[PDB]
Design a binder for this molecule. Sequence first.
Ligand SMILES: NC(=O)C1=CN([C@@H]2O[C@H](COP(=O)(O)OP(=O)(O)OC[C@H]3O[C@@H](n4cnc5c(N)ncnc54)[C@H](OP(=O)(O)O)[C@@H]3O)[C@@H](O)[C@H]2O)C=CC1
Ligand SMILES: [Mn+2]
Ligand SMILES: [Mn+2]
Lengths: 379, 379
Amino acid sequence: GRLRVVVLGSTGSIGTQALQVIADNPDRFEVVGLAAGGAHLDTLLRQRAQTGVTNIAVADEHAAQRVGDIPYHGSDAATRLVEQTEADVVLNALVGALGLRPTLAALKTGARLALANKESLVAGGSLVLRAARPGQIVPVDSEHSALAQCLRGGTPDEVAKLVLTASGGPFRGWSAADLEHVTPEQAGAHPTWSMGPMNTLNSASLVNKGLEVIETHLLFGIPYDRIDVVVHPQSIIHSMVTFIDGSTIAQASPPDMKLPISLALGWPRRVSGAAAACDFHTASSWEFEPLDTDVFPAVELARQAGVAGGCMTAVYNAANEEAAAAFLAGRIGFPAIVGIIADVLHAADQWAVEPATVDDVLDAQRWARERAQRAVSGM
Amino acid sequence: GRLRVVVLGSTGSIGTQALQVIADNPDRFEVVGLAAGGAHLDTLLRQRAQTGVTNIAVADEHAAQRVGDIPYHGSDAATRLVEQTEADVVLNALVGALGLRPTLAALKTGARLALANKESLVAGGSLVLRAARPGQIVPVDSEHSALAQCLRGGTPDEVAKLVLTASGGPFRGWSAADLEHVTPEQAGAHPTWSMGPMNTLNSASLVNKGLEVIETHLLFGIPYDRIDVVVHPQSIIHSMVTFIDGSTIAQASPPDMKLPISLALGWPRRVSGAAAACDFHTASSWEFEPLDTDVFPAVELARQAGVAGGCMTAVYNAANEEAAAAFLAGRIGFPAIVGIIADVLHAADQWAVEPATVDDVLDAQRWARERAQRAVSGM
Ligand SMILES: NC(=O)C1=CN([C@@H]2O[C@H](COP(=O)(O)OP(=O)(O)OC[C@H]3O[C@@H](n4cnc5c(N)ncnc54)[C@H](OP(=O)(O)O)[C@@H]3O)[C@@H](O)[C@H]2O)C=CC1
Ligand SMILES: [Mn+2]
Ligand SMILES: [Mn+2]
């Protein structure tokens, strides 16, 4: 009675940690599908051999050709893999708003969607939500996993606030002037989490936290004015829920994604030995500080976009993707990332309309990328 | 609807705070009984006048002589009140040995027992556990209330460890050499108005934490070797549960006993506005450090007593009461408190037998008191 898992983005950080959790728990889990982009064929072939799964999607046609006998190849490969593979859980660890169609396909199959790809939910918004039954989307994200656990501390009507923690990034405490000179190398560091290149930059810019505020509203149905963000440099407390009696329930663990991965895969059942627990035989401190919203307005912009609703959250994410690419390429400065997002959101009148189809979401993103490029061109 | 509440020990700290919670929540609670010792008879009489509750009990027959219209007076007045009063919740906030019989009576009525009286569990042990049905006892103290909330984080089978937080008391971080100089005043002997000198002393000696560890075992059925203590000077995290996957769930609030009191009264339902929540607008830190068990062995000793079982925890507590009072009277030094507890316990193996009656518990306490007296005097 074990769970069949499709792993999308298997060669990345989350995909590989997920495979390790599955390998350590053959009793509970079985890999039945793998999807990757094709940039790391060494890893993918290793995964094919180690798991014995030949049911693979490779996005890059040239890379799929070089491997040979890949059953699904091309831009729709991951989507068709999901549509055609019998599974109990789809782990979406793809990166960027491109995880949207596989997310929608997964929900349509009725399987659990263990969601690491927050962008697909942020972009899909109510379109993704309509495709899901209650509890079908289970968060892999450390914060959202923590929130889901802490919500067990009371009934829904007893929730006052959801409190997301943020690491603060490498630039915690820096001034606006300090941020002007930030290099791609400087933004490529993270004090607590080891992640891919986009999540690391997003954590530095605080856009990751903005995306997580939106994800929180969408997953848990809590109003934006009841979703708080506190800076916690240690990343040990992964988030908390405050109840109407004044009690706060918090989730805590040394930073290790295998914990929320393991919990997402086998929800509601915890997976014995998934990760190390906090060690209370040695001294430590858990520090909290307010976010400097003047220097880091990305979270406030996310709330604005979220409150607007419809396709506005897709716009927020798409504008970030474009500005982020420009920064990494050395075309714009670091403060310009969130500056461009604000510029694009301000122009995004038409996009408050609720998406009826995936094409509405794609239209919004297409516009947002263009408007983002316009803003880059002007600086 | 409205829960009918009997308040035993209505004139003490817990009792009066509970009456405030009840006054503030007339939708949720109604007082249907009040019981007190008699030393604060005037307060009880004012309480009858304020609540309109005439169903009252006074233990002290002398005190009762002052009134003429008390329905329940004399020894076991509180017990008789419990036996003869229809109620949904009995709050047992009586102090010491006079709490045990009312606890037993409350359990037999089938009411929920909101338990503050430590002696009921620490001394009464298996007598109380054999009488109680699952979930019948709801703990009132902050650590136990924290644990009950955090246990919501998983199934019973998913619990790895219970971690109680401890303030560390006034001598946190003190060497054994430092402790030799401790005076009653330093250990918290002030004529404070609401509470006896023992509470502050028991905190300082770490015996209170030991008592809490024993009660934790009895309340939640977790072995002593899986009940840990961490020193946390802020007392914001009130305790935590570590699950088999590595996740820790923690309960946090600014110190305020109205929170755990309100939740014990309303269990399982939280009481809106009971206490203030953690506020993250100003920076703070939550510090943890190990307890030096060489310098503070009171908790290790409690586990030893608890593992031994039967009436051994009764012995532990009674030896403390005697030794702690001897320290306050200047008959011994501070380090000798836990020293005498150890010496009495090590001589106490005849008391490992399970008590059949309340008198068996009383015999054990009698022996332990006499034993500690000889240890103090040198006889
Ligand atoms: N990493 C973390 O610790 C955390 C991650 N997340 C979220 O999870 C998601 C992934 O995180 P992360 O593992 O770090 O990302 P990574 O960059 O480390 O891995 C990205 C994965 O997606 C694959 N991929 C890229 N492009 C395509 C494409 N066009 N088609 C199909 N597959 C593609 C890559 O395969 P390949 O490169 O071989 O072509 C790779 O396996 C993100 O949305 C992130 O926000 C959330 C919380 C923390
Ligand atoms: Mn996250
Ligand atoms: Mn306590």
